[PDB]
Amino acid sequence: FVSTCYLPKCAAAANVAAHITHCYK
Ligand SMILES: [Zn+2]
Numbered sequence: 001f002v003s004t005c006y007l008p009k010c011a012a013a014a015n016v017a018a019h020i021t022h023c024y025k
Pocket of ligand 1: 002005006007010018019020023
């Protein structure tokens with residue numbers, strides 16, 4: 001979830017895909 005992302009510059013439009021796209025476990 002982009003809302004619960006760890007690194008900044010991820011939440012630009014509340015897009016989950018744009019977050020998990022590069023953000024992984
Ligand atoms: Zn992220």
